[PDB]
């Protein structure tokens, strides 16, 4: 799975040419701030499908796979 800088850091190059392997893409910072968990979930899922071009995603929950609550973790198609 290749994703863009925009996917990973939130801004930058648009084309999907960053290799992340077989795991999730870390969309840094997409779940930061004071919005509700539901609203953050929507922002994250749409960043994942619309920018990372994955199937969906979810905010960090402290697990090994999704360790940072401020980050959004996107799954491939």
Numbering used by the authors: 1 to 77
What did the paper state?
The protein also contains a second domain made up of a small βαβ structure that is connected to the core domain through a coil region. The C-terminus is truncated after β-strand C of the core domain and does not contribute to the second domain. The core-domain of FS50 is composed of a five-turn α-helix (residues 37–52) packed against a three-stranded antiparallel β-sheet (residues 25–27, 55–59, and 72–75) and is stabilized by three disulfide bonds (Cys 44-Cys 72, Cys 48-Cys 74 and Cys 31-Cys 59). In the second domain, the α-helix and two-stranded antiparallel β-sheet are formed by residues 5–9, residues 1–3, and residues 17–21, respectively. A fourth disulfide bridge between Cys 7 and Cys 52 connects the two domains. Notably, the loop connecting β-strands 1 and 2 of the core domain is elongated and folded back over the core domain β-sheet.
In this study, we describe the structure and function of a highly specific ion channel blocker from the salivary gland of X. cheopis, which belongs to the FS family and has been given the name FS50. The FS family of peptides is unique to fleas and has been identified from the salivary glands of the rat flea Xenopsylla cheopis (Rots) and the cat flea Ctenocephalides felis. FS proteins contain six to eight conserved cysteine residues forming three or four disulfide bonds and show relatively weak similarity to scorpion toxins.
